[PDB]
RNA sequence: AGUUACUAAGGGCUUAUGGUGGAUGCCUUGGCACUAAUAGGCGAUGAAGGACGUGUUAACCUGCGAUAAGCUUC
């Protein structure tokens, strides 16, 4: 699932995925300050995600 | 007038038990001293050592560094 990304537009449309990607575990960290956060499990995916992208 | 078993508040001796206490005996992911090979350094591309932080997981230990108990590739 990194070959998937190589593919993507590598210059341009990685920066609009970071920005989502920040975002969506910017409000999933703070779901998981109070509660209905039902999948702990998406925080460390998404970081994870992250991860990749940057790299 | 006289003789002498019983007393045991408590103690003593042996023998049996019970409690504390952790020596002797068996053992060990630990240490010691050595051999034979390898290698004899790290660092402005910012080290050694430290702080601080990071979790679906409280603290501590460990790993790791805002890509943060993990990322890419063979």
Do not use: C, M, W
């Amino acid at each position: 699932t990194v070959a998937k990304e190589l593919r993507q537009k590598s210059s341009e449309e990685l920066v609009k995925l970071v920005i989502k990607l920040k975002g969506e575990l910017l409000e999933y960290r703070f779901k998981l300050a109070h509660g209905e956060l039902d999948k702990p499990h998406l925080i460390n995916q998404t970081r994870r995600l992250l991860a990749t992208i940057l790299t």
